[PDB]
Design a protein around this ligand. Sequence first.
Ligand SMILES: Nc1ccn([C@@H]2O[C@H](COP(=O)(O)O)[C@@H](O)[C@H]2O)c(=O)n1
Ligand SMILES: [N+]
Ligand SMILES: [N+]
Lengths: 222, 226
Amino acid sequence: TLPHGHMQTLIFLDLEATGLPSSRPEVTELCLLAVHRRALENTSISQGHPPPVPRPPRVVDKLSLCIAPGKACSPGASEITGLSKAELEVQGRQRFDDNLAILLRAFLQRQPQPCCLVAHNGDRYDFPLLQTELARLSTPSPLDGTFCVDSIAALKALEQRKSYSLGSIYTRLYWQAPTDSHTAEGDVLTLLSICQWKPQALLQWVDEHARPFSTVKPMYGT
Amino acid sequence: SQTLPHGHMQTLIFLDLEATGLPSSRPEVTELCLLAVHRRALENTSISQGHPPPVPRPPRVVDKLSLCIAPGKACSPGASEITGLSKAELEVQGRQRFDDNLAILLRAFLQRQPQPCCLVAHNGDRYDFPLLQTELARLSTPSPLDGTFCVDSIAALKALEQASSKSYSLGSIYTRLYWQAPTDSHTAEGDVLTLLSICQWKPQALLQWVDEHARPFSTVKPMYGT
Ligand SMILES: Nc1ccn([C@@H]2O[C@H](COP(=O)(O)O)[C@@H](O)[C@H]2O)c(=O)n1
Ligand SMILES: [N+]
Ligand SMILES: [N+]
């Protein structure tokens, strides 16, 4: 008895932004990687020690975008993300605007439903912040029929002290350092690899814990 | 007093697609990847030094779209072997056809890029661009690529390698420049990233060639009629 049925699409998501929550941050980068349930189930299962790092499914949809913020990145944010408001502006990046919502809506529409976003620390950071950015637009949110889960909770359950930083998890499971860029897409690819460690168990946990994105409280309001 | 045909391109969009077969089969697209890079990000690439130069690092600021598309006809056995895609598997995974919503998606992606914008595709003039024109011609939307320019990177790399003086396949060029094999060949995103690397070899010369040779995508003749 699942709350919202079997999820047919998992969208691995990462957001980068200008700072930490009390700073009222703005998104500077966004990556979505949509995988069908069956592509995850077709991940080959490894019983060796260490398990090889899974490769991504052949069939994936990917969207990665840089976004000009209205406010400057903190020094810590620019160091960690490698992005700056000034550099995003000189490369002509656009704000989080109605055309971006058109793009997101059309990308989501290509995915079989029910669909669930999966983000590392999404419950405390990525999801509330995405909710805030979408709430500013006059466009109705394209995510109001989408579900979501936090992969920190997923991996805590799948593993049954331990750090739950993305890199710490990857190294604990695969016993090699992560090699992805430190970009939103690199973080999404590292998360996909972690989620392919026990893909059937991950899907089961996601099905049991999916909640409507419409219930995510905005990080901050107008 | 000689002028560029369409001004300085502000965005290069590296593009590749996979499809069900070769042109005489009247193929349909099964995968599409666009990778948009601002002129300034390309010009920022560290100068290639040494023999071989290291494979350039992709710019930090890029926009990427990669999509799988259900075709209405089967892939040839050779197309499915090379690309790793089949109609049956794309359908099992619920992929949608090339439709109006996909054109709306592409348009909104393109609208985030500063203009003038130029598509860059390897063998684009004979394959990718005519095929995309055919697919877009079936739709009820305007073309999302009205206003966008295009060029074929085979001609470009022929020019640039002649200047620093052969197969001009994507892999042959990459291996000549960098002395190792590309990865993820014959996948849309893997081949886009290989093309980006080749075009980062001599970015200023590439941008000058592209500026001089860009043509409107609206002038590309469809591969076949509908
Ligand atoms: N030997 C070959 C080479 C290319 N092709 C077709 O050319 C398309 C594009 O080629 P690339 O993979 O080089 O981009 C393939 O997706 C495939 O449909 C083929 O069907 N047989
Ligand atoms: N990988
Ligand atoms: N599993």
